[PDB]
Amino acid sequence: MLKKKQLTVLDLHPGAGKTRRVLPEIVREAIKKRLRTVILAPTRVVAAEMEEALRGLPVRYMTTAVNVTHSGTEIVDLMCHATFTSRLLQPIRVPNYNLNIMDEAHFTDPSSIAARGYISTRVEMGEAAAIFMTATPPGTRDAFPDSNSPIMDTEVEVPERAWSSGFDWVTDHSGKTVWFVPSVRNGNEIAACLTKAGKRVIQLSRKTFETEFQKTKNQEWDFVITTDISEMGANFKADRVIDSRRCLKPVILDGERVILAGPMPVTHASAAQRRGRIGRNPNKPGDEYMYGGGCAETDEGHAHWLEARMLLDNIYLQDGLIASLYRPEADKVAAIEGEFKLRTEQRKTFVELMKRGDLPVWLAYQVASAGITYTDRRWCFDGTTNNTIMEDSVPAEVWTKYGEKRVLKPRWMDARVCSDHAALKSFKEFAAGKR
Ligand SMILES: c1ccc2sc(N3CCNCC3)nc2c1
């Protein structure tokens, strides 16, 4: 697998041992052949599990999630998918890795899709080798793959709001359940209902993931309410998965705004990953998987694939060449390669709005391409009246950096800056000039 111009898809079923058994064997062989190697982890939680599997081997951990003292003589680097893409965009020097290993390579966040595009292009050019590790490669149509022990699959109506009656099976269970919901707000309602019935509930989402995941190990729980982030290697000691089979989808309308469409069906890859949290112990047969809807290919037209092209158009590859998306996922977006390429100064603004501003890729692009500088926030208040952001059924308001109270009305509206309480609080701080 380690020879140039070759990209291998390691598609062993979930729990077949890709991370704890296969990955260290590959790393040993790469060190023996003096291949400059990069290992890409989706989250800091997976990066911690990888250190445990690779203990003793010389690996340079480019993250604060691991507390290790490096020798300085490591030729294997380990970082998150987002860190790799961010370093490529920034003026920092990134080595031309001979071997590129991506764990949980199904991750659909814009930075992950961009990393897959960059790596597969280098492989197509004959410069590097690559290994993509996932049970669900792009375009998979099987939502019920193999497992370490048999699973009981049941199609059933799953509540998406609080309930008083009609779903006794949910609360009559005496084990641990992981429940996948389409949004943070929907998880809040279901968590409140379960807490009122006497259940101990933990909630997980993108922003709270590392902090709250530790609670699944440190304390006793009955239910874990999670968004789609738990599809990326999160391991639980549970006996049941309740899957609404629904997700939200960011959609760019008329090329001028982003809305959060849905809830709508998940892809087969997401359903199989959600089901894959159980049936992992060969000594425990009969874990349950209750699903409340069907699958569909809802990644077509999803804004993350357009955002990945915005990222790839601003990454240097060779002279005027631009990396293409990984071939099995390149048709998810209708886009012209190079159409998002920015000049040096606007590109720096684009990077700072994403890194420091913490804004979505699409929104950072509209601001930077309009010739606006990072600290200029006049655009957060000069949009049309239909762009007014609402908080508790009344327009959201902030004190501008000038000391003036104004209604939040951005020139470009992206639903992700106000999808929950935490998101709107962070966007208000940005509009006020606080970061
Ligand atoms: C050794 C060599 C280079 C880097 S960059 C880095 N970080 C950058 C961003 N993520 C957190 C830490 N850590 C190292 C360690």
Identify whether residues 173 and 223 lie together within a single domain.
yes
Structure token digits, residue 270: 């997401």
Nearest CA to ligand 1 atom 10: 63
Identify whether residues 74 and 176 lie together within a single domain.
no
Asked if residue 13 belongs to a known ligand binding site, the reply is yes
Identify whether residues 204 and 235 lie together within a single domain.
yes
Asked if residue 14 belongs to a known ligand binding site, the reply is yes
Nearest CA to ligand 1 atom 3: 62
Asked if residue 16 belongs to a known ligand binding site, the reply is yes
Distance, CA of 218 to CA of 214 (rounded, Å): 6
Using a 6 Å cutoff on CB, does residue 96 contact ligand 1?
no
Using a 6 Å cutoff on CB, does residue 83 contact ligand 1?
yes
Q: Name the experimental technique.
A: X-ray
Task: Report phi then psi at 321, rounded to 5.
Answer: -70, 145
Identify whether residues 123 and 159 lie together within a single domain.
no
Give me ligand 1 centre to Cα 348, in Å. Answer: 20
27 is in which domain, residue-wise? Answer: 7-133
CB 215 within 8 A of CB 202: yes
CB 103 within 8 A of CB 39: yes
Identify whether residues 165 and 284 lie together within a single domain.
yes
Using a 6 Å cutoff on CB, does residue 62 contact ligand 1?
yes
Residue 175 CA: distances (Å) to CA of 81, 109, 188, 403: 34, 32, 21, 54
**Distance from chain centroid for Cα 173:** 30
Identify whether residues 67 and 118 lie together within a single domain.
yes
Give me ligand 1 centre to Cα 23, in Å. Answer: 22
Q: How do beta strands 7-10 and 129-133 pair?
A: parallel
Identify whether residues 264 and 204 lie together within a single domain.
yes
Task: Report phi then psi at 350, rounded to 5.
Answer: -55, -45
CB 59 within 8 A of CB 30: no
Structure token digits, residue 236: 């639980």
CB 424 within 8 A of CB 388: no
Distance, CA of 390 to CA of 418 (rounded, Å): 9
Asked whether the bond before 91 is cis by omega within 30 degrees of 0, the reply is no
Asked if residue 15 belongs to a known ligand binding site, the reply is yes
Residue 264 CA: distances (Å) to CA of 29, 120, 292: 44, 30, 12
CB 260 within 8 A of CB 253: no
CB-count exposure of residue 378 (10 Å: 0-12, 13-18, 19+): exposed
388: left (phi over 0), alpha (psi -120 to 50) or beta: beta
Atom number, ligand 1, closest to the C-alpha of residue 79: 10
Identify whether residues 125 and 156 lie together within a single domain.
no
What distance, in Å, lies between the first and last C-alpha atoms of the chain?
45
HEC assignment per residue over the chain: CCCCCCEEEECCCCCCCHHHHHHHHHHHHHHHCCCCEEEEECCHHHHHHHHHHCCCCCEEECCCCCCCCCCCCCCEEEEEHHHHHHHHHCCCCCCCCCEEEEECCCCCCHHHHHHHHHHHHHHHCCCCEEEEECCCCCCCCCCCCCCCCCEEEEECCCCCCCCCCCCHHHHCCCCCEEEECCCHHHHHHHHHHHHHCCCCEEEECCCCHHHHHCHHHHCCCCEEEECHHHHCCCCCCCCEEEECCEEEEEEEECCCEEEEEEEEECCHHHHHHHHCCCCCCCCCCCEEEEECCCCCCCCCCCHHHHHHHHHHCCCCCECCECCCCCHHHHHHCCCCCCCCCCCHHHHHHHHHHHHCCCCCHHHHHHHHHCCCCCCCCHHHCCCCHHHCCEECCEECEEECCCCCEEECCCCCEEHHHHCCHHHHHHHHHHHCCCC
Name the one residue in this structure whose structure tokens are 């020097």: 93
Identify whether residues 109 and 166 lie together within a single domain.
no
Atom number, ligand 1, closest to the C-alpha of residue 60: 1
Nearest CA to ligand 1 atom 14: 62
CB 308 within 8 A of CB 113: yes
Nearest CA to ligand 1 atom 4: 62
Give me ligand 1 centre to Cα 63, in Å. Answer: 5
Using a 6 Å cutoff on CB, does residue 63 contact ligand 1?
yes
Structure token digits, residue 18: 């890709």
Atom number, ligand 1, closest to the C-alpha of residue 86: 9
- Asked whether the CA dihedral 275, 278, 281, 283 is positive or negative, the reply is negative
For the beta carbon of residue 329, count every other beta carbon within 10 angstroms.
Answer: 20
Identify whether residues 111 and 181 lie together within a single domain.
no
Distance, CA of 193 to CA of 44 (rounded, Å): 31
CATH of the domain at 268: 3.40.50.300
